[PDB]
Enzyme design. Sequence first.
Site, PDB file in Angstrom:
ATOM      1  CG  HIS A  28     -25.664 -76.264   6.032  1.00  0.00           C
ATOM      2  ND1 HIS A  28     -24.442 -75.742   6.373  1.00  0.00           N
ATOM      3  CD2 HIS A  28     -26.505 -75.205   5.905  1.00  0.00           C
ATOM      4  CE1 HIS A  28     -24.530 -74.428   6.431  1.00  0.00           C
ATOM      5  NE2 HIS A  28     -25.780 -74.081   6.195  1.00  0.00           N
ATOM      6  NE  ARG A  50     -18.510 -83.434   1.421  1.00  0.00           N
ATOM      7  CZ  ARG A  50     -19.113 -82.261   1.647  1.00  0.00           C
ATOM      8  NH1 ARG A  50     -19.743 -81.619   0.653  1.00  0.00           N
ATOM      9  NH2 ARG A  50     -19.087 -81.714   2.869  1.00  0.00           N
ATOM     10  CG  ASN A  54     -19.136 -79.084  10.222  1.00  0.00           C
ATOM     11  OD1 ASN A  54     -18.724 -78.311   9.354  1.00  0.00           O
ATOM     12  ND2 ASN A  54     -18.706 -79.051  11.454  1.00  0.00           N
ATOM     13  CB  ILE A  55     -23.184 -82.333   5.732  1.00  0.00           C
ATOM     14  CG1 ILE A  55     -21.923 -82.391   4.863  1.00  0.00           C
ATOM     15  CG2 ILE A  55     -23.913 -81.013   5.491  1.00  0.00           C
ATOM     16  CD1 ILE A  55     -22.274 -82.477   3.390  1.00  0.00           C
ATOM     17  CB  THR A  80     -17.618 -70.237  11.605  1.00  0.00           C
ATOM     18  OG1 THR A  80     -18.279 -71.080  12.545  1.00  0.00           O
ATOM     19  CG2 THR A  80     -18.620 -69.848  10.531  1.00  0.00           C
ATOM     20  CB  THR A 100      -6.814 -71.331  12.555  1.00  0.00           C
ATOM     21  OG1 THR A 100      -5.396 -71.462  12.584  1.00  0.00           O
ATOM     22  CG2 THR A 100      -7.305 -71.047  11.114  1.00  0.00           C
ATOM     23  CB  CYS A 145     -37.323 -93.804  -3.964  1.00  0.00           C
ATOM     24  SG  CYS A 145     -38.391 -93.773  -2.539  1.00  0.00           S
ATOM     25  CB  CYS A 204     -37.420 -89.848  -2.665  1.00  0.00           C
ATOM     26  SG  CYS A 204     -38.212 -90.365  -4.214  1.00  0.00           S
TER      27      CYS A 204
HETATM   28 ZN   LIG Z   1     -39.647 -91.963  -3.333  1.00  0.00          ZN
END
Ligand SMILES: [Zn+2]
Lengths: 7, 265
Positions: free
Chosen positions: B121, B68, B104-105, B213, B239, B170, B129
Amino acid sequence: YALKRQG
Amino acid sequence: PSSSMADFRKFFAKAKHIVIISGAGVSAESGVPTFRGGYWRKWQAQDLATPLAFAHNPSRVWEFYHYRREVMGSKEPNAGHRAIAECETRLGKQGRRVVVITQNIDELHRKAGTKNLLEIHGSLFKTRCTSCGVVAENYKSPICPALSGKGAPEPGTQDASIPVEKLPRCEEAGCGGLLRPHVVWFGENLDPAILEEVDRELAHCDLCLVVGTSSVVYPAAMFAPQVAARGVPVAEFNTETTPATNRFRFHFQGPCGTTLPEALA
Ligand SMILES: [Zn+2]
């Protein structure tokens, strides 16, 4: 309330 | 629920705090795959955006997010994204507030100009981490070496089964903890700092827009119904009608790409 969930 | 734009524009010219809630409908108009029903291999977002999926198959989940992340490189904001960002600049200068609250991300709202953005989100391009909890922006492609040339969306593709030790770790001195995407998964809570920003926006809201949405993901689905219940007009731009549409003052159908440039002019 805060929980992400579908439905 | 009215299908009249003239009546909308009358509230629009007056409104002083306007909240815009944006859903996957807006990103799909940029060609961003929203895996909400469509699949990544034999799965949809609901099967992989879960803490269980990550616990049992973190390799699979990272493959998915990796996919993604990489797909976003080519992608750009659309007329709907631009119209919303322009409106926020324009109205800013009239002493008027505009806030975008996005499910949305993909960060396409950021790329478009939107400043008052609440990403309820999380983001594709932030990691967290799971040892020390530091949240870090991360745009590196690939996010880790063991993921280079992985994440193909075609079904049948065998799982890379990268050992947990070679998935994103990390970089904080001394940690070595396993990273996850800083995205809110199903079964988890939204960030409390984010929920308070929203609570305030929804309360002192003025006119609410709900754009692209499907209104089937909670809590985001309750936000506009909250506002309408307060006697505040809500326009739904989508839509296709939703389970919440009948609670809203307006429904305008169409691609938000076609309807918003007018509505927000
Ligand atoms: Zn960490």
